[PDB]
Structure formats: structure tokens, C-alpha cells
Design a binder for this molecule. Structure first.
Ligand code: FMN
Length: 361
């Protein structure tokens, strides 16, 4: 089933082998600008059923990693237009993953060198990636954030809205809202990171309020059939857990998302460091609550993907690290060919080495 077509909102994927969003931290600074090298990397992978881009800033404030691209400035829009054109030239499809990093950030890459923002004022207690004086990636402890004031929340929603407008102009086929992995939207969703006492904290309805305002805004800006969302609602991701009622809270959020008739739900099932597997019962509960495409991700194999697609529980699989190392992953999985070995040391930062130099068959 992996090599059969699938309608995904406004487009049709020719296969179910998707490229997961993968931060590679190779953009130009100053300007957080996509490059021709990034264009080549995505063009090499255009046989994917769908490419989901690396996480991309909705605004300058959204930045948390040196080398991550934006989709807020004219120069960024112009550069992304070239990238999507290259993918389209090879008959591919590409979604842009849009984030605000919130508290997973550092003051040195924030506007004015000031503290980053979040739901509440507590430190992420993790690291982000900056660049040193020679442009090489380095890991640095996160800066303590300040809590967004209530009157700043509409501006966040507007920044997502505007970034989706920009994505449409840049020629993306779809957008993926980054509501996972401990970034801003997840910081609001999670009780561990959200201690607010206004209408954006406390109950699950309040904790989900921001992400649902964002979904509504971007559906209105473009169209619901252009919108996907990535969630990581079971387990702990970058120190952000999903709280004591994670299953019930996940199902609440998914039911709300379904009301908007969006294109897809992308579930990041496990952190890279591992987590409890999804039960089939939970998968069935998700499936009956959402009426668009469901994408599974997190250490999948082709075998696991075929099993779950055949069981009618998911529609597609996003592969991350296998896509880093195998531009023609689709052809390799179809032919049962060996994969190129991964070189994790060059996942983040640097240049062509470990990026565009993994060969196709
Ligand atoms: C180098 C690296 C960068 C990643 N960057 C992102 C990101 O930008 N956005 C996101 O939602 N997930 C990101 N992830 C998670 C992947 O999308 C994926 O969930 C993870 O790779 C598990 O899938 P895999 O076992 O197929 O690699 C990243 C993972 C890796 C390895």
C-alpha cells in the first residue's frame, strides 16, 4: 500500500512515503534565508509522496536556532519560491512547517537581544543551537522566557496567519503548523509549561485555545484543505510532557481540529530518546475523531507503515532520518534496496557534506 496514491487536502500524493520535517540549520545569516544548497537538497527528495520542510519561522521573534529559515521577510519569500519551484519541476509536492520556538531559544538571536517568549516565565531547561564566530553549530542553554501578556496573543495568531499568506505566495502546496516537540504551541498545550491563570491556561480547553485560534486564522486566510498540523501529544518531548491526562486531552484536541476540516493530522509518536508505543485502541480512537489524512512518524519502518496503513489506522508515514540519508527513499523501499548509512554528526549545520552528498541509486 505504501506506493499507492492518497488525496491530501488540495493535492494528491502518488505514494505514502513522506519526508518528515527536519531542521538542518544551513540557512544564510544574516536574514535566515534559504539557500540554493537547500533547494538542491529538497529537489533530490522530490519523489516523496509529500515533502514537509524543515521548521520555518513565522516571524523574527519565532527564531530559536541559528541557521533555521524564516518565511516572514521579502528575501525569505523570494528564496523559498525558488525551492518550491525546484520541487515542482520534479513533479513533487512540498508543505512548509511553520513554528514559533517560544522558550526553546536564546536572547542572542531574539530581536534586540531580549528574552524569548512563552506561555509562562520558566526556563525550558534544555539547549538550542547557535553558531560560533566561524559559523559552526554549537549547543547553548536556553534563555529564561517571559510570559506573553494577554494583549500579545492576537499578535502571535496574526504572525501565523501572515506566514501562511506568505507560504501561499511562495508556492507551497500545504502548511504544517508546528504544534509539537515543546515549541510555542505545545508550551501552551502542556500543563508542565503553562501556568497561566487567564483563559489560555488551566483546563485543556484553555490550553488548546491558542492552537485552535491559530488553526481558525490560517483556515480563514487560505483554505482548510491547505492546512496540516503536527502534534506530539503522548509522552515527553524536550522536557515538555503532556500532563496527567494526556490521552483524554489529545482526543479533545483532535476532535476540535476535526471540526475545522483540515487536510491532515501528523502525529509524532515518540521522542528520539524513546517512549511508550501507541496502542491500537488509541489509534482507533484517533482515527474515528479525525476525517482527514493521518500521518504517523517516529522510528517507523516500511513494515510498520504497511501494517498500520493496511489496518486502516493511518494513511501515510513520514520518515526523518532515512530521508536525510536516502534522497530516493521511495525507490529504495519499492525495490527493497539497501539504504545509505546515516551520518548523524552532520545532521545540524555545515554545508553540502552530510546534506546533498548522499547518493541516489
Ligand atoms: C536532525 C533532525 C531534525 C529534526 N527537525 C524537526 C523539525 O524541524 N520539525 C519537527 O516537527 N520534527 C523534527 N524532527 C523530528 C522528525 O521529523 C522525526 O519525527 C524523527 O526524525 C523521528 O522519525 P525517524 O525515526 O523517521 O527519523 C527532527 C529530527 C531530526 C533527526
Amino acid at each position: 500500500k505504501l506506493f499507492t496514491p492518497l488525496k491530501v487536502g488540495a493535492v494528491t500524493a502518488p505514494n505514502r512515503v513522506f519526508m518528515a520535517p527536519l531542521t538542518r540549520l544551513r540557512s544564510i545569516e544574516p536574514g535566515d534565508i534559504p539557500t540554493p544548497l537547500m533547494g538542491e537538497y529538497y529537489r533530490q527528495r522530490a519523489s516523496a509522496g509529500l515533502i514537509i520542510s524543515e521548521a520555518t519561522q513565522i516571524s523574527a521573534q519565532a527564531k530559536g536556532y541559528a541557521g533555521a529559515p524564516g518565511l516572514h521577510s521579502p528575501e525569505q519569500i523570494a528564496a523559498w519560491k525558488k525551492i518550491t519551484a525546484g520541487v515542482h519541476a520534479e513533479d513533487g509536492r512540498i508543505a512548509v512547517q511553520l513554528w514559533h520556538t517560544g522558550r526553546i531559544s536564546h536572547s542572542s538571536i531574539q530581536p534586540g537581544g531580549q528574552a524569548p517568549v512563552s506561555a509562562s516565565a520558566l526556563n525550558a531547561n534544555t539547549r538550542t543551537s547557535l553558531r560560533d564566530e566561524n559559523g559552526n553549530a554549537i549547543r547553548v542553554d536556553t534563555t529564561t522566557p517571559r510570559a506573553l501578556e494577554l494583549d500579545e496573543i492576537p499578535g502571535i495568531v496574526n504572525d501565523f496567519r501572515q506566514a501562511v499568506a506568505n507560504a501561499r505566495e511562495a508556492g507551497f502546496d500545504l502548511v504544517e503548523l508546528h504544534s509539537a516537540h515543546g515549541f510555542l504551541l505545545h508550551q501552551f498545550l502542556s500543563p508542565s509549561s503553562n501556568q497561566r491563570t487567564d483563559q489560555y491556561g488551566g483546563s485543556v480547553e484553555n490550553r488548546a485555545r491558542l492552537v485552535l485560534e491559530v488553526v481558525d486564522a490560517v483556515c480563514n486566510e487560505w483554505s482548510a484543505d491547505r492546512i496540516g498540523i503536527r502534534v506530539s501529544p503522548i509522552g515527553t518531548f524536550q522536557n515538555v510532557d503532556n500532563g496527567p491526562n494526556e490521552e483524554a486531552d489529545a482526543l479533545y484536541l483532535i476532535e476540535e481540529l476535526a471540526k475545522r476540516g483540515i487536510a491532515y493530522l501528523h502525529m509524532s509518536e515518540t521522542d528520539l530518546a524513546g517512549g511508550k508505543p501507541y496502542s491500537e485502541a488509541f489509534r482507533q480512537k484517533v482515527r474515528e475523531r479525525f476525517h482527514g489524512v493521518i500521518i504517523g512518524a517516529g522510528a517507523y519502518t516500511a513494515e510498520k507503515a504497511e501494517d498500520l496503513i493496511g489496518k486502516g489506522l493511518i494513511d501515510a508515514v513520514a520518515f526523518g532520518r532515512d530521508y536525510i540519508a536516502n534522497p530516493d527513499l521511495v525507490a529504495r523501499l519499492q525495490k527493497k534496496a539497501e539504504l545509505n548509512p546515516q551520518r548523524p554528526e552532520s545532521f545540524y549545520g555545515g554545508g553540502a557534506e552530510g546534506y546533498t552528498d548522499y547518493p541516489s541509486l
